[PDB]
Design an enzyme around this catalytic site. Structure first.
Site, short mmCIF file in Angstrom:
data_model
loop_
_atom_site.label_atom_id
_atom_site.label_comp_id
_atom_site.label_asym_id
_atom_site.label_seq_id
_atom_site.Cartn_x
_atom_site.Cartn_y
_atom_site.Cartn_z
N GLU A 155 101.73 3.88 72.37
CA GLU A 155 101.64 2.65 71.62
C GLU A 155 100.25 2.02 71.75
OE1 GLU A 155 105.45 1.51 73.57
OE2 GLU A 155 105.98 0.90 71.53
N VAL A 197 99.81 5.92 76.56
CA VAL A 197 98.87 5.69 75.47
C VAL A 197 99.55 5.72 74.08
CG1 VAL A 197 98.26 8.09 75.08
CG2 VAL A 197 96.56 6.30 74.63
N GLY A 254 104.36 14.81 72.51
CA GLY A 254 104.01 15.86 73.45
C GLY A 254 104.53 15.81 74.87
N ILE A 283 109.25 13.44 70.68
CA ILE A 283 109.34 13.15 69.26
C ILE A 283 108.02 13.40 68.56
CG2 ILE A 283 111.22 11.51 69.56
CD1 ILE A 283 109.32 9.30 69.83
N1 LIG Z 1 97.96 9.87 80.46
C1 LIG Z 1 98.44 10.40 79.32
C2 LIG Z 1 99.22 9.63 78.49
C3 LIG Z 1 99.68 10.19 77.34
N2 LIG Z 1 99.38 11.52 77.01
C4 LIG Z 1 99.89 12.12 75.70
O1 LIG Z 1 100.31 11.21 74.78
C5 LIG Z 1 101.77 11.25 74.71
C6 LIG Z 1 102.30 9.84 74.84
O2 LIG Z 1 102.65 9.53 76.19
P1 LIG Z 1 103.20 8.13 76.63
O3 LIG Z 1 102.22 7.06 76.30
O4 LIG Z 1 103.65 8.33 78.04
O5 LIG Z 1 104.42 7.78 75.68
P2 LIG Z 1 105.84 8.47 75.49
O6 LIG Z 1 105.76 9.93 75.90
O7 LIG Z 1 106.89 7.64 76.11
O8 LIG Z 1 105.98 8.53 73.93
C7 LIG Z 1 106.55 7.51 73.14
C8 LIG Z 1 105.49 6.76 72.37
O9 LIG Z 1 104.81 7.77 71.52
C9 LIG Z 1 104.13 7.21 70.37
N3 LIG Z 1 103.46 8.22 69.59
C10 LIG Z 1 104.19 9.05 68.76
N4 LIG Z 1 103.63 10.23 68.42
C11 LIG Z 1 104.34 11.06 67.62
N5 LIG Z 1 103.79 12.25 67.26
N6 LIG Z 1 105.60 10.69 67.19
C12 LIG Z 1 106.24 9.50 67.50
O10 LIG Z 1 107.39 9.22 67.08
C13 LIG Z 1 105.50 8.60 68.33
N7 LIG Z 1 106.02 7.37 68.71
C14 LIG Z 1 105.14 6.47 69.47
C15 LIG Z 1 105.88 5.47 70.26
S1 LIG Z 1 106.54 4.10 69.40
C16 LIG Z 1 106.05 5.60 71.63
S2 LIG Z 1 106.93 4.34 72.51
C17 LIG Z 1 102.20 12.25 75.80
O11 LIG Z 1 103.36 13.02 75.43
C18 LIG Z 1 101.00 13.11 75.98
O12 LIG Z 1 100.99 14.25 75.16
C19 LIG Z 1 98.59 12.28 77.87
O13 LIG Z 1 98.27 13.49 77.65
N8 LIG Z 1 98.13 11.72 79.02
SE LIG Z 2 108.40 1.39 69.16
#
Ligand SMILES: Nc1ccn([C@@H]2O[C@H](COP(=O)(O)OP(=O)(O)OC[C@H]3Oc4nc5nc(N)nc(O)c5nc4C(S)=C3S)[C@@H](O)[C@H]2O)c(=O)n1
Ligand SMILES: [Se]
Ligand SMILES: Cc1cc2nc3c(=O)[nH]c(=O)nc-3n(C[C@H](O)[C@H](O)[C@H](O)COP(=O)(O)OP(=O)(O)OC[C@H]3O[C@@H](n4cnc5c(N)ncnc54)[C@H](O)[C@@H]3O)c2cc1C
Ligand SMILES: Nc1ccn([C@@H]2O[C@H](COP(=O)(O)OP(=O)(O)OC[C@H]3Oc4nc5nc(N)nc(O)c5nc4C(S)=C3S)[C@@H](O)[C@H]2O)c(=O)n1
Ligand SMILES: O=C(O)c1cccnc1
Ligand SMILES: O=C(O)c1cccnc1
Ligand code: MOS
Ligand code: MOS
Ligand code: FES
Ligand code: FES
Ligand code: FES
Ligand code: FES
Ligand SMILES: [Ca+2]
Ligand SMILES: [Mg+2]
Ligand SMILES: [Mg+2]
Lengths: 160, 291, 330, 420, 110, 53, 157
Positions: free
Chosen positions: C289, C287, C48, C45
């Site tokens: 949230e 990361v 990434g 969303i």
């Molecule tokens: N060790 C890590 C952890 C994270 N990442 C980067 O940060 C992103 C977030 O990863 P993660 O924390 O695993 O979370 P999710 O992929 O499950 O993403 C959902 C999270 O993402 C957040 N950030 C957002 N960012 C955008 N652009 N749009 C949303 O709707 C978003 N919504 C929020 C909310 S609320 C949530 S719950 C990854 O796709 C990645 O590109 C990384 O490179 N290396």
């Molecule tokens: Se959320």
């Protein structure tokens, strides 16, 4: 209500359309011309996602009636690409990390380009003010601004 | 959206003719559309005849005369904030224009639209009120001029201002700043772009060689239907030199008149305070310009 | 007058659903030319996740990032990836991709093995199966490996799924193991408060996040920069108002519900902190949230520091600033 | 730190190209032949039974293909990410402003609006509950079931009653956070249709397509393998796109008209109808010794989950598990009560209750540091979690814990860039 | 084949084929090989998927012997010296255990 | 897919072949027919290219 | 060349279109009306894949000029379905196994429908000759015929 004839230069080419006047320019571009890159994020001029370059200036198409595009030159994101390839500015958004969800991106790129076409070497402050009409909920603007700065430097770089 | 007839006159004469023909509809003029298109889209306005005047490039101008400055109604805020003289010597208008919406809105939005909308929080409205501007209204019946203050107080085909159904604002006029005169504007708002003014503070003054204050204008944009006239405060300044302590002496006065005249406003308790922080900044601005 | 202050906010955030099963799955196929496809349900969303999975698959398989193709969020051809929430995708779907790649590597490793050796062999790295395990020599390119794979009638396909190792929580005392990994952060913020107008300007922010290991530094930084900005808005601009007569939200529009513009954002210095042992892909944890959380308490603390009073309620609007200031006088 | 082949590198995203070129299609950018447009008739009252609903005049408008109420649903009419307390179309009663009552499918957006304007309704208004105080009064009407109490949690660790007596300092304050909206730049949008091979499909702006599928299949009484959900390029969610938005209304209109049905929400309706962050009020008492070491934390909190549960369950527990902060506290007690009200639906918004919790635990740490005259960063390093620390749920940290590094690195950077 | 191997209704099975982006290489449709070669690939993919279904089901006294077939329900090697179990109850236990049933498989004539 | 990718020097993963509903082949559709000719033209014009024999 | 006005009843509804006459009825249906069920397997009237019910009678649309469809009643496969559901005939084709590659199916069904709409109870021979204008390379025609015989029987009731 009688239909009207709108003559304009859209993405490099002279277009002509006979249509109902009761629609916004945003609707004309999206529906009649199929340029879906022009987004509708708010319908009230705030988000800037519906921005297009209009006679050289960035404007919010949701605030305009279709007929007002008459005798105008408009550039939407679709018209930035160079022979189906990413322009320098576009390549910079790709690399600077300025793109997250990508919904505000068409607007951001157009606003940046509108500035660079007028002032090839803007100050950081000028870049900011120029793009202050585009809201982003993902990036915090940091990297979007970097992308433009990077484009300005690489452009100057091309001093060979 | 609602169906309607759309005209785009190529000359002022044709526009006047159209306005007259459809005056009983009544007609709905459209310039930059930053107010109207939204009113139409959200269905707050349901026009049957729309008259686009954007092709009237003749109404886009900034003529700096010896004692007055004449600005065409179609002048966009972008054209206004970019004008070197405006940016250099009429600070109140410069700051207001440069802080209206965003660049996109400034590229479309015209001063005629701003003044014709007469919004409670209109920044062009507030600045032009502070500078005690005069507007020119024309139609097939002729032309008339009126102080912006009277234009607002009046009621034409709509209550917001004196415009008649067949009229078109063609120009706004303000006095040109003399050697030692100054104006300031401060936009109190929640964010630094695309913000609606909470208080659009405007101040302008004139002095007579000795440094004595001769004229004073202090307006509280957004603290009244139209910019709040701080009359008592102005009169306190006329007749004496301008110093921080003399200007600050009016502060309790601004407080009291905001609470009195803005009695029914929802945020009166906050604005009667912040209006003091606002004008102090205005005082600084004014003083540095005169020095 | 203008008063500046600095405030610190640290946070903790469990990754994945709290003491509940919440798996994700993925599919992988390595093509004969050393490129590949990855299928996973995890929705991207904007954060990434699609790119992260690609880099993860690349690293794990030892192929070029540019050679990986990814498909996601299509229930007809991608396996359930669970919801993209709880900053869980990098961890759960990420591990699900690794497992998928490992199964696929079984045949690749066996064919690569067929050249003197077997399991112990660091396959994958810059498009070549290196015999490395004691002798980086006796290499073999992925182009050469697939040729052997074909000659043997073997295909590199894999399916994987992962679930964090957690325990439910007892209802009496909430005891148990809710998360298998937690993220941490510390953000320090500087603000400038106007004591007479109540305006609050956020000047600078330093936000440090323990992410285990970053899959893509630039994407993590974007999360942080976006999060800090979302935090600034949380405290100083954003506020939904409700009409207690009909229960309608009064300010649902973009012009009435205020979020930061680019001219509001402060100078943001992000710091990526790594930690070892993590159960995630290559030790990576969420990361998404976490990027938002710490900013909020830091801004509040920073305003308290500038003014010399307490604020235990958000949002802190200009009227709240003035009231506090007036309350310090007489 | 480990020489990764590609990991960590700022690789251009696999989906950035379409976004910078303007070819990327978000749900509203999709159009199909014979596609109809849809809208929803929503309640303008907060709590009430529907006495009458007239759809005849809306149905009579030339250009309107369907105007449906709950009677048109062939399967179930209860949904929800965690608790199935949300209807697709209101049946028994309205529980919030903007409750979905009927849907319309027509040839143009203007026809849809015309249809909505032609629908009339009569409510039998019940008492609208807008305060948690009134919600907890047992004589107040029950929005769901027999009580307005939605969730309750209690965390008991060590012994806070004994602990507080051993403290040299105790700070006590009531904290509260407000209601916020996600405000992703792309408003909710979706389009459903049967594809060339008869496959029921929904292209939508979502964060969880597989969840969406189960709901749609359940509404239409179809197996999961026969309902295709395609997550379109999504313009952000931040938690606000986890709950069902347009998936069912579209699918339902398509099931009945057999034609493609597109539904793009105005920003206004999107905000009015989508979830919000739970406003919470947390009463906290935090104790410690003179050296600044934490001995006990006690929190008593309340959350307004609004008209429907949404992530209410996930929020109350997560907030309960983290409200002592990222610090080793040998004694913790937590009482949390989330209640149903006719306020807008509270759901998932980046943080799941922790942003609200941090306002509390960090506010406490800073008051402690100030009173004990310690540096805010030091008082945190002192109590910080480390591999081996015992958590309030009995859990012991075994790996990946770098809180102290964030603390040190952060201060070091701030000293340099802001004069800390 | 998938239905028989999994013990599910043919009507509940959905298939996608010949799409390089998301379907694995199934070789050319020639030499009357598909039913044989892709048929086995499917069974093998099903079996891997059944590994968690069987493990989950077996966690009810037994293991390898179970028979995940016939009218949507995992019975027992013999019959009912220990009652059977429905797919519906199995999927609920799969969910409760945090397991998913996915598989990949390939085959090549010997 | 391999052939097209070969013709355009693209990794296989970057070339998508969708076998549409096919009206019989009996072996006559194992060899390449229009795949490369269409792709080649779409590569140069960047537009969709339809070829119906 | 001037565009001509064409009025006809396509799939149950009165349509009308002004277009150039230099095209075949098959093109008009496929391109102008988007009816892609009407296939083009040979371009010479042999396979029958382009068959449509032209005034109660099946005809090869690849042999007709667009203008000739004026004042006529045309039914293509899309017009057979009953409110989006498979008619009886279509259902029989499904259950009988009369479908392999499915390229000839549209024509087959239209020919069988044209027949049954005139002769509810046809002889197997009348069925054969009736569909002898449609070629199939997959089924051997056996099961296609069975589907028609199948439909007729269920037609009895
Ligand atoms: N060790 C890590 C952890 C994270 N990442 C980067 O940060 C992103 C977030 O990863 P993660 O924390 O695993 O979370 P999710 O992929 O499950 O993403 C959902 C999270 O993402 C957040 N950030 C957002 N960012 C955008 N652009 N749009 C949303 O709707 C978003 N919504 C929020 C909310 S609320 C949530 S719950 C990854 O796709 C990645 O590109 C990384 O490179 N290396
Ligand atoms: Se959320
Ligand atoms: C996102 C956004 C942000 C905004 N921010 C600001 C801001 O910060 N400050 C602020 O002051 N305003 C703001 N506005 C409002 C608007 O931009 C201004 O009021 C603008 O100056 C109006 O000019 P316009 O040409 O667009 O007018 P229009 O919308 O065309 O019309 C204004 C009204 O006046 C009439 N009218 C227009 N021109 C004439 C004329 N010459 N003679 C007679 N009647 C005429 C029209 O018929 C209509 O009723 C904002 C609007 C948007 C959409
Ligand atoms: N034990 C079996 C064997 C076969 N079948 C059925 O018969 C078909 C043939 O299966 P198989 O023999 O495995 O052959 P393929 O699926 O690999 O099909 C290719 C084969 O199929 C043939 N028959 C064809 N049939 C049609 N309709 N179209 C073609 O192009 C055909 N081309 C030919 C040629 S040439 C070849 S090489 C299966 O799909 C199945 O429906 C079955 O039910 N049980
Ligand atoms: O979806 C859930 O139930 C959930 C998500 C995050 C944290 N706790 C629970
Ligand atoms: O009908 C199907 O199941 C189908 C059609 C085309 C491609 N894959 C599956
Ligand atoms: O979708 Mo945020 O947990
Ligand atoms: O394609 Mo027939 O072996
Ligand atoms: S849709 Fe035009 S500015 Fe937001
Ligand atoms: S990248 Fe998502 S709104 Fe800007
Ligand atoms: S194309 Fe008409 S009969 Fe073959
Ligand atoms: S079924 Fe293939 S040609 Fe008839
Ligand atoms: Ca072929
Ligand atoms: Mg969803
Ligand atoms: Mg809730």
């Amino acid at each position: 209500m009688n239909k009207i004839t709108i003559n304009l230069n859209l993405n490099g080419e002279a277009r002509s359309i006979v249509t109902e006047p009761n629609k916004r320019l945003l609707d004309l571009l999206r529906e009649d011309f199929g340029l879906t890159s022009v987004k509708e994020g708010c319908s009230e001029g705030e988000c800037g996602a519906c921005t297009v370059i209009f006679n050289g200036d960035p404007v919010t198409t949701c605030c305009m009636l279709a007929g007002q595009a008459d005798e105008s030159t408009i550039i939407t994101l679709e018209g930035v690409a160079e022979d189906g390839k990413p322009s320098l500015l576009q390549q910079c958004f790709l690399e600077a990390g300025a793109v997250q969800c990508g919904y505000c991106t068409p607007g951001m790129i157009l606003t940046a380009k509108a500035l660079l076409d007028k002032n090839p070497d803007p100050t950081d402050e000028e870049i900011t003010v120029a793009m202050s009409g585009n809201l982003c909920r993902c990036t915090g603007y940091i990297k979007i601004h970097a992308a433009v700065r990077y484009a300005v430097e690489r452009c100057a770089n091309a001093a060979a | 959206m609602k169906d309607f007839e759309f005209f785009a006159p190529k000359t002022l004469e044709e526009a006047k003719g159209l306005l007259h023909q459809y005056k009983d509809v009544p007609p709905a003029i459209i310039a930059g559309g930053t107010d109207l298109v939204i009113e139409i889209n959200d269905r707050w306005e349901k026009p049957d005849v729309v008259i686009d005047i954007k092709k009237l490039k003749e109404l886009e101008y900034i003529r700096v005369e010896e004692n007055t400055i004449h600005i065409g109604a179609l002048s966009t805020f972008t054209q206004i904030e970019n004008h070197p003289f405006i940016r250099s010597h009429v600070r109140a208008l410069y700051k207001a224009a440069s802080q209206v919406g965003s660049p996109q809105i400034r590229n479309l939005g015209t001063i005629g639209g701003n003044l014709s909308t007469s919004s409670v929080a209109g920044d062009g409205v507030s600045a032009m009120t502070t500078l005690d501007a005069t507007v020119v209204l024309e139609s097939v019946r002729g032309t008339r001029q009126m102080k912006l203050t009277d234009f607002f107080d009046g009621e034409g085909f709509k209550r917001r201002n004196a415009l008649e159904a067949d009229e078109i604002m063609t120009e706004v006029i303000i006095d040109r700043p003399d050697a030692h005169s100054a104006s300031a504007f401060y936009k109190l708002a929640k964010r630094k772009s695309l913000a609606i003014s909470v208080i659009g503070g405007g101040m302008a003054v004139k002095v007579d060689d000795a440094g004595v204050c001769t004229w004073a204008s202090m307006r509280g944009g957004c603290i009244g239907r139209y910019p709040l006239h701080f009359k008592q405060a102005e009169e306190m300044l006329v007749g004496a030199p301008l110093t921080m302590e003399t200007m600050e002496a009016t502060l309790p006065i601004l407080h009291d008149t905001v609470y009195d005249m803005a009695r029914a406003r929802p945020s009166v308790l906050y604005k009667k305070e912040s209006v003091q922080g606002v004008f102090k900044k205005l005082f600084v601005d004014i003083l540095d310009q005169l020095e | 007058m203008k008063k500046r202050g600095k405030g610190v906010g640290s946070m903790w955030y469990g990754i994945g659903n709290t003491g509940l099963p919440n798996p994700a799955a993925a599919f992988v196929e390595i093509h004969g030319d050393g490129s590949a496809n990855v299928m996973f349900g995890a929705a991207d969303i904007g954060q990434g996740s699609g790119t992260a999975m690609a880099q993860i698959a690349a690293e794990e398989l030892g192929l070029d990032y540019e050679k990986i193709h990814v498909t996601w969020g299509d229930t007809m051809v991608t396996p359930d990836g669970g919801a993209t929430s709880a900053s869980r995708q990098t961890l759960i779907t990420g591990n699900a991709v690794i497992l998928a790649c490992r199964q696929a590597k079984e045949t690749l490793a066996k064919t690569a093995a067929e050249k003197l050796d077997c399991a112990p062999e660091e396959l994958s790295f810059r498009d070549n199966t290196v015999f490395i395990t004691a002798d980086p020599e006796r290499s073999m390119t992925y182009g050469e490996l697939m040729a052997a794979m074909k000659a043997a009638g073997r295909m590199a396909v894999g399916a994987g799924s992962y679930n964090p190792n957690t325990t439910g929580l007892a209802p009496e005392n909430m005891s148990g193991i809710p998360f298998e990994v937690y993220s941490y952060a510390t953000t320090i913020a500087e603000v400038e408060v106007d004591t007479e107008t109540g305006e609050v300007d956020v000047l600078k922010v330093v936000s440090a996040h323990d992410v285990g290991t970053p899959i893509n530094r630039s994407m993590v930084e974007g999360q942080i920069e976006g999060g800090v900005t979302m935090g600034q808005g949380f405290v100083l601009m954003e506020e939904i108002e409700v009409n207690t007569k009909n229960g309608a939200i009064k300010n649902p529009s973009m012009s009435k519900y205020i979020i930061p513009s680019n001219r509001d954002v402060p100078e943001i210095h992000s710091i990526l902190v790594e930690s070892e042992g993590g159960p995630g892909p290559f030790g990576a944890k969420g990361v998404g949230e976490p990027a938002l959380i710490p900013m909020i308490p830091a801004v509040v603390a920073a305003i308290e520091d500038a003014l010399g009073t307490r604020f235990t309620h958000t949002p802190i609007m200009p009227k709240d600033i003035v009231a506090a200031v007036k309350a310090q006088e007489k | 730190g480990k020489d990764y082949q590609v990991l960590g590198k700022n690789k251009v995203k696999v989906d950035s190209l379409e976004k910078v070129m303007g070819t990327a299609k978000f749900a509203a950018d999709y159009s199909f032949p014979d596609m109809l447009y849809a809208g929803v008739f929503r309640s303008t009252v907060p709590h009430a039974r529907i006495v009458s609903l007239d759809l005849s005049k809306a149905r009579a408008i030339d250009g309107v293909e369907a105007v449906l109420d709950y009677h048109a649903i062939p399967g179930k009419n209860r949904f929800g990410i965690i608790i199935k307390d949300e209807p697709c179309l209101v049946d028994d009663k309205v529980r919030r402003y903007g409750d979905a009552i009927a849907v319309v499918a027509a040839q143009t957006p203007d026809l849809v609006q015309e249809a909505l304007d032609a629908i009339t309704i009569e409510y039998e208004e019940l008492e609208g509950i807008f305060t948690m105080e009134r919600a907890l009064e047992e004589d107040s009407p029950a929005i769901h079931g027999d009580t307005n109490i939605h969730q309750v949690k209690h965390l008991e660790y060590g012994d806070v009653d004994a602990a507080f007596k051993q403290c040299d300092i105790v700070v006590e304050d009531t904290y509260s956070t407000h209601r916020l909206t996600h405000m992703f730049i792309e408003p909710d949008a979706g389009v459903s249709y049967y594809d060339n091979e008869g496959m029921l499909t929904v292209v939508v702006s979502t964060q969880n397509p597989h969840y969406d599928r189960g709901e749609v299949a359940g509404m239409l009484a179809l197996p999961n393998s026969k309902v295709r959900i395609i997550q379109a390029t999504t313009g952000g969610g931040f938690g606000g796109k986890l709950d069902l938005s347009v998936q069912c209304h579209c699918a339902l209109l398509t099931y009945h008209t057999k034609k493609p049905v597109k539904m793009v929400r105005s920003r206004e309706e999107s905000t009015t109808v989508s979830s919000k962050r739970h406003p919470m009020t947390m009463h906290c008492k935090t104790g410690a010794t003179k050296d600044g070491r934490l001995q006990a934390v006690q929190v008593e909190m309340f959350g307004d989950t609004g008209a429907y549960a949404s992530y209410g369950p996930a929020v109350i527990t997560r907030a309960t598990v983290h409200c002592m902060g990222p610090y080793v506290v040998p004694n913790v007690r937590v009482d949390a009560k989330f209640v149903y009200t006719n306020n807008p639906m509270s759901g998932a918004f980046r943080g799941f209750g922790v942003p609200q919790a941090s306002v509390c635990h960090e506010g406490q740490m800073n008051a402690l540091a100030k009173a004990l005259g310690m540096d805010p960063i030091d008082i945190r390093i002192l109590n910080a979690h480390q591999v081996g620390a015992k958590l309030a749920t009995g859990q012991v940290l075994e790996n990946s814990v770098g809180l102290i590094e964030t603390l040190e690195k952060a201060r070091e950077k701030a000293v340099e860039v802001m004069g800390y």
